[PDB]
Write a protein that binds this ligand. Structure first.
Ligand SMILES: [Cl-]
Ligand SMILES: [Cl-]
Ligand SMILES: [Cl-]
Ligand SMILES: [Cl-]
Ligand SMILES: [Cl-]
Ligand SMILES: [Cl-]
Ligand SMILES: [Cl-]
Ligand SMILES: [Cl-]
Lengths: 218, 218, 218, 218, 218, 218, 218, 218
């Protein structure tokens, strides 16, 4: 287990992280953690490792890009004095390119995404025990679908930043890809982004694996 | 796995089971499955065994005792033609005795409990592939608390019904008792019955273990 | 115009048709017609051909397959004594196969689809002035995406039913496919089914073209 | 087509423009454009000219007179840096004269309307590619009805300003008048101002014609 | 006064009458009487003639034509055993012809109007103390506006039915016409039908005059 | 008629005046005037004297005493530049003495009521054409009921102030007393303060009489 | 105590009794008992005599007269098999006479009141352990107020029915009259019927006294 | 009676005190006092001692610890100029230790509780006539249940502070303990903190006893 008792683990990202979490505090109660992978991660850890006295805070915000992360970083990350910070961002940075193709101001293109994401990592790195970088994902098994293709380029950036900064790394796309061998995307998410419970469980599983709790087939 | 692809797994019980499931159908989306252990079970199995193509229905109803199960059994169980039926009932049968001590008609005493549960199991067993009997529970580590002691007695009934009928069996009390070595009950459930996400995870993990998916530390 | 003054045009289908139409009557105001392509058709015809005194009824119901159409056909179509009946059904018949792959009873497979649609058209044809068969559609430009491929197969059914019965015919897929040369699907519909105003305009424009009002560039 | 790809087209006016648009931004989504002629214009352009990558913003506000326009001009027009600005105002300036005849402070009489409207045009003109002036209208075919009479005087002012300032011009009254040869006003608008879908389609058609997309009978 | 103490006065009609009255009973409080001319009549009579102990029931229903009155007459009039019945119907009978010109089944043409109203009056007359026939109205001072002209024709029917049956008679059109010498219709009713408090006062004052309480200037 | 065309008449007081009026403006619409005597007064004047082009504003506020009036006087009276001001206050000043007998800070005793009311009158008097002072009232026919007794002392103060300052005067208590010869108070107001429509009509009648519109029996 | 452990005490009456009790059952929680004197009685007995294991049901319904009690007596009293029945009815029987003086069919005059109450008591007496008749009341200290005088007459009926049938008897008027030596009615109930918590306490204290729990000063 | 007429008694604490009271004032109405023991205390005093003209204010706030009390003390206690202050705090200070065991910042441990509580007492003591210190409580009869054990240590501190500062003292735990000889905790409070009406009555009784109104068995 990478995380120890008494440590504070903070999650940040977009709607996939948010999942209705309590604003602004994002702690004090699972209600407060929202109803997706963050809550699942906390619940699974309490069920299986109840002696691991970790404090968890959810600072996800629906709609956010990496630009939006940067704008709130000081208040929502640095000021919370976390020990561990998990980041999952990029879905919107990409999505907007595809759903609002002519609203170019809402697009965060790859060079800016990369640099800004790296900046957040390295502002945080000296202040914390560790960082977990989770890739964005798109629930689409065709690697040539334009938005899945773009997404994978963003995810490859995340992986490079993780390696460069010695952060922990979760490839959320690979976790989905395995299930997409079996299920059509709609079975997980109508819009290929916001998943069912099962999709949140895919996320929670992938996260937990990287912090040293690996849920496998019997 | 005990359960196979193409098989229909139907959960029945009280609020622990219900968790806001869609009425009457209790199927067709996880929204429809509610927000507790049933959904968690379905989601964990989809995340980890997506090729296990089980169809799941949630027939939980808040407040029910086994007397209420009997009254709706034909419509809500038999007529659904399930392959596997999971029963978790007894919390209310017990609780009423302690929260409304003088309203004896709302109590389901051990004789009624045993005879009705037994009868439901024997009636159902020839019509289905299998039955999973889950014990009621009370989130209270003191075995001499009166309601805990009672609940343990109802759980003994369940265990013996399952042994006799060769049903699968989940000891939910023992699942909570392990966590209660660490946590005071209010950390899981203010009222000792309705738990947080973590409590629902305890339940899902105990269910899954008995059907052959065992989640363990490491 | 194919349709004349004083004639009753009745639209039937799923949510694409429904769009929040007034239940049960589906007539007596545009509020009553809902907020999608049916209303747009009625409004464009009133704006451009106000002397075409058509009466329009919207009998769309969200979620329906052709199996549901059959169950309500006497009350919602025959008993309304329409002059023209417009049918757009198949999206759900298909989608269920992909979003709920294991709930086979919610699937309407090609044999059921063809036989039921065919039967409805032949039963209705002698009772009315004319029938307009609109294909289902899937807003996805990759012909090899599994659900798109399926949907194209259901559309082939529609096209052949219409040829055989001398019904009018709208190829809604081809209408979307032209736009999909330019736009990624999420620009029209996050879930590839339920579109923006622009998607409803695509639909209304294809409908109108087939009844003899062709909107073209310049 | 007067408008080019990558250009920003901004609509301003009263409730007829507003139609429930998102405040304050009025962009990002059709929901955000509201449910009337502005949304229709955007939808028709996307359906028929999807390669015309125009960005559209709706700054309509229910209740507004030309006075109200002037009070918000800098924030809601100039600061948005539009390429094209469409204006439709005057309905309320007139209406109040008739519905609140003794509340004279709410009345905007013709000399002030003219001068203030011209001022807005010529403050904007050097900053934009072009301007589209849409007349007010009143859905009343009797040219001697007092409020229709007044309205026409306002519309004649708009036309003079358009000619004087070399703005594009839409005579919304003429567009209604054509349909009023056939329909009584109540068929379009109970209150002779806020129309049905069809009335919004009349507006959208008239607008589109002037920017070079002319929808005609087949 | 035409009406005496201890007598039951029942009002029936459309929305003008209804004004949000309590359903089904329409009695037992003014809340129950709604917020328009019925309530105003009752309140003025209580304020000025408190010893006139009349009991008043409001059976207005929004949207009704005389065809709807007939369908409910036994339950909502006869079975209430009133002493006096006040009828104001025809606005919708007319309006539909103009707002939904092509939905001819919603129209109640003069032949149906006259025969049904006449029949209701003659059936009712032997069972009650008296009948008060109030004309429909249209708040429009131009006698040549088509809907006004129609409405005047329906009012002629009412007037002649009342003469023949020796019913009391209120000319609501003439009551509005006097005010329309001063005010444009929108000052009383944007849609020319549903008026402000002032319009309801016009109505109450005309009703009261015919039952022998005349409110006059000075 | 004391009031002339083009003049502004402003009403101020407590809930009896307020009656749900629009805050803060209290004008622009009858909705905005609320649903009691103020609206009735405006409606009766429009119905009978539509050429009297008066502008009316309702600044009543539920719960107010004369202290509360004084605290808002400058904004809600003086700044509105009325021509005529009507005041009805004192019900709460008295009521509190009786319903909250030990919360003495909420009580406004007679010497303070008198002086403060006079102060408001004489601050306004030089600024306006005239003032109408309406007595408080209590809908109770027993002159020895403690709260009716107190009320009458307040009303006698109002009358003295009116005489001293040459203001117009409405004795609302006398208007109620006449009807209380016939009806028990509950028939008008359960709580002997907030009346039915009829009670509001009693008020409106009494007000109108004093400004020169006297509604009498035929 | 007059009532014993294991006995079912059922309260029936109007809104004073109802106080928002759960419909239809009126039992199973205090929420279910409503928020007035019934709940207070149950709570005081539980606080002070917790070993008195009484089961309490609230069958109050707002608005009821004794005529309404009769209509529901079989279902809401007899079929509940109570041991003790507490009746408090007459407020509405009286009040209607004064608040709706002309709606004589809503009045329950003394002859109907006495005969119906008497009949209910005699029918019920052989089926139960005991009956407690509580007088209606009117919170008004002037014995010559008309409605108070009436109410006192109905209370005399109750007192004499109870004497004759050897029922227990609570004089609620006398309980209020003692407090009314100090407090004006509006301090307890603006409408003289529906009281504050203090009024419900007066009621509970009078009930309790008659069943042998007397709360006294010191 | 320790408290005299004309004195102001102020209650402060957590949810048990709060019970939905009006914010911020917490006075003016029982609605405003909330629906628990504070309201009961006021009601019982008004019912039995209506001449005791005490003014009562409820400043309870749900969730509060002694830290939270200290943060609002000046505004919510000192500024209100009470004559008597009742304090009941500590439930949350303890609870958090048990329900959120790893969120240590939310815990108020005993040495801080003691000192801070004493500080509030002695800041208030010179300013008031007297102080009533009510112990926290936990509705659990097992003195060795960890949270009941902790609670009792807090209550013993309260008692020591009361003795040291010559404050009045209510042992709320002892009052519950007596009833817990008979009832299981769930019969009073599912969560062992927020009780039924009966539990609030236990509290009100215990409070009243200490101020000299002792409610005993007959
Ligand atoms: Cl998002
Ligand atoms: Cl339950
Ligand atoms: Cl659908
Ligand atoms: Cl507007
Ligand atoms: Cl109507
Ligand atoms: Cl008030
Ligand atoms: Cl009642
Ligand atoms: Cl709390």
């Amino acid at each position: 287990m990478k995380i120890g008792s008494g440590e504070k683990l903070l999650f940040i990202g977009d709607s996939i992280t948010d999942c209705g979490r309590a604003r602004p505090e994002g702690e004090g109660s699972f209600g407060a953690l929202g109803t997706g992978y963050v809550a699942y991660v906390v619940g699974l850890l309490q069920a299986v490792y109840p002696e691991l006295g970790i404090r968890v805070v959810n600072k996800g915000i629906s709609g956010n890009t990496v630009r939006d992360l940067k704008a709130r970083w000081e208040e929502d990350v640095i000021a919370q004095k976390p020990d561990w910070v998990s980041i999952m961002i990029g879905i919107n940075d990409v999505w907007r390119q595809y759903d609002l193709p002519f609203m170019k101001e809402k697009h965060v293109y790859l060079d800016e995404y990369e640099a800004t994401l790296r900046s957040l990592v390295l502002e945080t790195k000296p202040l914390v025990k560790g960082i977990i970088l989770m890739t964005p994902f798109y629930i689409e098994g065709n690697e040539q679908d334009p938005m899945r293709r773009t997404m994978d380029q963003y995810g490859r950036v995340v992986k490079q930043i993780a390696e460069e900064t010695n952060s922990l790394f979760v490839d959320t796309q690979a976790a989905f890809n395995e299930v997409l061998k079996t299920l059509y995307p709609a079975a997980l998410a109508w819009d290929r982004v916001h998943p069912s419970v099962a999709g949140h469980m895919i996320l929670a599983r992938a996260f937990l694996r990287e912090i040293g709790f690996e849920i496998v087939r019997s």
